Amino acid sequence: MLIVPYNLPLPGGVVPRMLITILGTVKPNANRIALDFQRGNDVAFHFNPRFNENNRRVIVCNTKLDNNWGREERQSVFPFESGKPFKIQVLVEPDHFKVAVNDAHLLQYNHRVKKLNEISKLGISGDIDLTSASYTMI
Ligand SMILES: O=c1oc2ccc(F)c(F)c2cc1CO[C@H]1[C@@H](O)[C@@H](CO)O[C@@H](S[C@@H]2O[C@H](CO)[C@H](O)[C@H](n3cc(-c4cccc(F)c4)nn3)[C@H]2O)[C@@H]1O
- Give the CATH number, domain containing residue 100: 2.60.120.200
Record the resolution, in angstroms. Answer: 1.2
Experimental determination approach used: X-ray
Q: Structural domain tally of the chain?
A: 1
- Dist. CA 133–CA 124, nearest whole Å: 9
Phi, psi of 117 (to 5 degrees): -75, 5
Q: Are 31 and 127 in contact (CB under 8 A)?
A: yes
Of 120, 109, 112, 96, give the one whose Cα is nearest residue 37: 120
Closest residue to atom 23 of ligand 1, CA basis: 69
- The whole domain housing 63 covers 1-138
Phi, psi of 106 (to 5 degrees): -115, -55
Q: Are 7 and 121 in contact (CB under 8 A)?
A: yes
DSSP element (H, E) containing 18:
strand 18-26
Q: Are 92 and 18 in contact (CB under 8 A)?
A: yes
Q: Are 19 and 138 in contact (CB under 8 A)?
A: yes
Distances (CA, A) of 19 to 31, 74, 75: 26, 22, 21
Atom of ligand 1 nearest to the CA of 70: 21
Q: Are 97 and 109 in contact (CB under 8 A)?
A: yes
- Dist. CA 119–CA 130, nearest whole Å: 22
Residue 74, strand partner residues: 60
Cβ of 62 closer than 6 Å to ligand 1, yes or no, is: yes
